[PDB]
Structure 1
């Protein structure tokens, strides 16, 4: 049977799924790690014990325990990101979509979901891999990994909660794909890992980490990079947040063993209920439990690794969206709201910049404010709103990705950079938010191909070229079929716009603002 596959870990039985009036096989909920429950909470994952019999993989697995967005109850714009399966600590599973008939040895793509390392699910409708598997003939895999304190509580020096275990969950899934994907028709020597936001930062983290490098071939990073200011913390800060979490739960804090033991008896929801109380500052675009620069998964600081070429050399394809920051302002900055144009007063602008660069002294806040204010029209509400939108996006996503791409390209074997600026005709979010963080995903996964979702014919065409650029790059290391997406080089720094208009090539994506965020501001904060 086409739906039965024998792996090194046991046999699994998939299910047949319809796709664009045809069909493919899906193997949903395959376990790749032992359930990280009880005494196993906070620990490195352990490989799944092989099973006898047949594993039923006809349905989506549970999602990992996480905070749930209730800001706009039933609004599809925000609920499309919430877990759509029951939550459980028993959540380490992966999903596979396989073309029909079963390939022999074709291109593999492994998706790593975003969600600020505190949320995310591999089962969201926007991540349904059937359209991409089908249209491009690739074996598509989506893995899962522990988020929040369950995945990133870090007490460096302890083996019970070493930190980075969520990243180790991702690695374990990649080890499973390396070891078993050949049985589903995938070529384990041609796997591309791709992800968005925290997922793109994760992808970049595996390019960096010695222990993950050999488990994949090429990489795609969407709106995220490893050096993002919100993607990692030092071991001292990780330790301090772990202790502060225990303090919120009235834990005995005399020793790591006491803290960890106390944290292990709490129900999942108790940790989720106070998780956000450990941030050191009043901030936006910062998350409590994230990867730690531990000297193991990351041997040295990310910057020295980037500087010395200490990373996997291969091809990468990556890019950003036009308005990466808008949704973080909607959720956390005064003056922004879902149902108004959100013209911002000068005082809310100033309140907005303090929230955006939480780690800055007064001089730093003045430098950011001067850099983004039009002083001949400072009370322009639209300009204040847009300026703040760009500050959040430039500082949290764009400039850190541009710093990564320039450092990577000096040692890599090929880079393709894009700027996604198409605002979907059917967007449910207000206009002011523009081309939102996460909204290039539906095009990568091909939702515009399904008529009922109401996209335009040109939106369907855009989705088909992106899907084909992504799969062709996964297959060959080049998005182009032998009108050309040129290679990004350290000399020319070319990139393309990705929208419904004839491809345009540009150069030096946001150089002006990024010299400010990547060179001047850090120099300024370090001296003052």
Structure 2
């Protein structure tokens, strides 16, 4: 049968799902590892031992234990990111969308959800893969990984909670695709991994990690890179937060054994109710438990690896959105509201920069302030809002990614940079937020194609050309169809540094995405802070 597939770990039964007046096969909730429960919490994942019979893979699996956003109860703008299925530590499953009839050895694209490494699910509506798998004729995989303490608690030295197990969970799902995707009509030699935000950081992390390199062909990074200030911590910082989590729950802090054993006795929600209390400073765009530069998953410092070219050399397609930071200012900085224009006073602007660059000293803070303050009009609420907006987006996403793209391009075999700046017609968030963090995803996933979602005709075209760029890139390493016809997305070179805007208007080629601000964030500020 088309829906019955025999994998290396057991039989699986999918379900025929309708998609845009047609249909396709979907294998949902396929396990790829042993439930990391009990004495398995915090430990490296273990392959799902083979099962007998037929696994019912017709419904979405559970979502990993995570923090749930309740800021705006009922609001679709925020609710669309919360788990839409029951949470559980038993959450290591992957979803697959196969074109019907089943391809022979077609391109495969593996999605890695974002969520600051503290949240995220593979079952969200904006990640429904039937549209992209169907339209571009690709085998689309949806993986999952442990988040928060459950996936990144790190006590370097210990083997019970070594850290980066969330990254290892992803790697095991990738090793699984490598071993069984051929049975679903996918070609394991042509697999592309792509993700947004924390997911984009992950992709760049597999690009770097020797243990992940051979498990994929190419990579796509959306609004995130391995070197983001919020994407990792030192073993020292990791241990401290680990111990502080224990302190927070009254645990025996004498040994990693006692601390860990204590943590494993707590219910999931207990660890989550205190998750945010371990951060070093009051801040925005900083998450408690994230990847650690251990010296194993990451041989050396991310920078030294980027400089020496120690990473997979292949093709990459990456980019960012116009307003990466508004979402985070709305939730954590004073003066911001989703119900107003959020004009910021000079006082709140100041509080906003300290909140945005929590690791900076006074001199650093003055440098940032000066770099984004129009001193002829310092009391302009609008310029203060947008300035603070750019600070958050530049420091946390755009510039770290530009540093990555420039370093990588020195060794890579092809780079394609994009600047997504389209404000969706049916956006439910206030206009001041602009092109919000995560809102290029619904276009990558073809949501604009479904009529009842009420997107405009031009947004459907944008979605269609974006999915095609992604898919064509996945298949060939180039988003452009060889001597096709339409405008050509140019390669990003260390010399020209070209990139295109992604929106509903004709293609526009640009150069040096936000160099001025990024030179500040990538070169000057670091030297300023390093000096004291």
SS state at 2:211 partner: coil
- Could you tell me which runs of 5 or more consecutive residues in structure 1 were left unpaired when the two chains were aligned: none
Give the Cα separation in 2 of the matches to 1:42 and 1:92: 13
Give the Cα separation in 1 of the matches to 2:219 and 2:275: 31
Return the offset for 1:444. 0.1
Give the Cα separation in 1 of the matches to 2:91 and 2:177: 17
Give the Cα separation in 2 of the matches to 1:474 and 1:40: 35
Return the offset for 1:265. 0.1
Return the offset for 1:131. 0.2
Q: Find the counterpart in structure 2 of residue 281 from structure 1.
A: 281
Return the offset for 1:365. 0.3
Return the offset for 1:278. 0.0
SS state at 1:378 partner: coil
Give the Cα separation in 2 of the matches to 1:501 and 1:103: 34
Please list the CA deviations of residues 244-279 of structure 1 after superposition, one character each: whole Å capped at 9, or x if unmatched: 000000000000000000000000000000000000
Please list the CA deviations of residues 40-61 of structure 1 after superposition, one character each: whole Å capped at 9, or x if unmatched: 0000000000111000000000
SS state at 2:410 partner: helix
Return the offset for 1:231. 0.2
1:165 equivalenced with 2:169 (yes/no): no
SS state at 1:26 partner: strand
Return the offset for 1:459. 0.2
Return the offset for 1:409. 0.1
Matching of residues 461-500 of structure 1 within 5 Å? 461-482=461-482, 483-500=487-504
Deviation beyond 2 Å, 4+ runs, structure 1? none
Give the Cα separation in 2 of the matches to 1:272 and 1:287: 12
Return the offset for 1:36. 0.1
Give the Cα separation in 2 of the matches to 1:438 and 1:257: 39
What is the TM-score normalised by the length of structure 1? 1.00
Return the offset for 1:408. 0.1
Please list the CA deviations of residues 217-236 of structure 1 after superposition, one character each: whole Å capped at 9, or x if unmatched: 00000000000000000000
Please list the CA deviations of residues 115-164 of structure 1 after superposition, one character each: whole Å capped at 9, or x if unmatched: 00000000000000000000000000010000000000000000000000
Please list the CA deviations of residues 53-94 of structure 1 after superposition, one character each: whole Å capped at 9, or x if unmatched: 000000000000000000111100000000000000000000
Give the Cα separation in 1 of the matches to 2:18 and 2:71: 34
Q: Find the counterpart in structure 1 of residue 523 from structure 2.
A: 519
Give the Cα separation in 2 of the matches to 1:295 and 1:350: 38
SS state at 1:211 partner: helix
SS state at 1:17 partner: strand
What RMSD, in angstroms, separates the aligned Cα atoms of the two structures? 0.3
SS state at 1:108 partner: strand
Give the Cα separation in 1 of the matches to 2:468 and 2:11: 32
Give the Cα separation in 2 of the matches to 1:374 and 1:62: 49
Give the Cα separation in 1 of the matches to 2:8 and 2:92: 18
SS state at 2:474 partner: helix
SS state at 2:275 partner: helix
Give the Cα separation in 2 of the matches to 1:20 and 1:382: 43
SS state at 2:300 partner: coil
Give the Cα separation in 1 of the matches to 2:372 and 2:453: 37
Please list the CA deviations of residues 96-124 of structure 1 after superposition, one character each: whole Å capped at 9, or x if unmatched: 00000011100000000000000000000
SS state at 1:215 partner: coil
Return the offset for 1:420. 0.2
SS state at 2:240 partner: helix
Give the Cα separation in 1 of the matches to 2:454 and 2:350: 39
Give the Cα separation in 1 of the matches to 2:258 and 2:52: 39
- Could you tell me which runs of 5 or more consecutive residues in structure 2 were left unpaired when the two chains were aligned: none
Give the Cα separation in 1 of the matches to 2:142 and 2:307: 31
Give the Cα separation in 2 of the matches to 1:468 and 1:12: 30
Return the offset for 1:401. 0.1
Give the Cα separation in 2 of the matches to 1:428 and 1:378: 30
Please list the CA deviations of residues 347-367 of structure 1 after superposition, one character each: whole Å capped at 9, or x if unmatched: 000000000000011000000
SS state at 2:528 partner: helix
Give the Cα separation in 1 of the matches to 2:105 and 2:454: 35
Return the offset for 1:336. 0.2
Give the Cα separation in 1 of the matches to 2:362 and 2:30: 51
Give the Cα separation in 2 of the matches to 1:81 and 1:453: 17
